[PDB]
Amino acid sequence: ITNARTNNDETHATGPIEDLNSTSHGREPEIESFADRAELAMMIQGMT
Amino acid sequence: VGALTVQPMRSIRSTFANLANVLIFHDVFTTEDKPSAFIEYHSDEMIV
C-alpha cells in the first residue's frame, strides 16, 4: 500500500478498456460545457 | 524453266492507285484506374 495527498489530477488509474463493463481503464474526457453561472446573493439581476 | 516454284505465287495486280485516302475517327472519352467512388464510409470511435 502507498499513499498520495494528490487531488489536482488522477495519474493513478491507467489502462485500456476491454469491454463496455470494464471498470479499470484510464480516464476519458467529457462533454465540453459552459459557464451556467447564477449565484444566490440577495437581489442579483437578470442576465438573460 | 524459271517460273513455277514450290513457294506460292501471286496474281497480276495492275497498278493505278485510283485516288486512295484515309479517314481517322476519334471518339472523346478516356480511362482511369482507381475506383474513386462518390459515397464512402467514414468512421469514428468512442474510447480514447
Side-chain angles (χ1 to χ4, degrees):
Chain A
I1 281 180
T2 170
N3 293 12
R5 201 285 189 203
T6 295
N7 309 123
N8 45 9
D9 64 337
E10 200 290 320
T11 314
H12 294 325
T14 62
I17 299 176
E18 308 204 26
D19 193 11
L20 77 160
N21 288 150
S22 199
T23 183
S24 299
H25 50 278
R27 279 191 187 195
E28 83 292 346
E30 75 300 337
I31 298 90
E32 277 297 330
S33 179
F34 277 165
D36 51 287
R37 293 182 183 174
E39 293 177 350
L40 287 306
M42 182 50 87
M43 180 171 174
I44 194 153
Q45 216 162 44
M47 206 285 267
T48 76
Chain B
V1 301
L4 180 44
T5 184
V6 84
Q7 213 166 325
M9 57 187 69
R10 288 187 198 285
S11 298
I12 317 301
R13 202 201 51 80
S14 89
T15 70
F16 276 116
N18 63 347
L19 269 297
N21 293 310
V22 162
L23 289 176
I24 288 189
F25 264 105
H26 285 274
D27 193 57
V28 57
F29 53 78
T30 184
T31 66
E32 98 279 0
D33 318 331
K34 305 326 185 302
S36 87
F38 276 165
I39 300 169
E40 66 192 323
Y41 283 155
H42 96 87
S43 175
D44 45 345
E45 62 280 26
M46 59 207 313
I47 52 188
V48 300

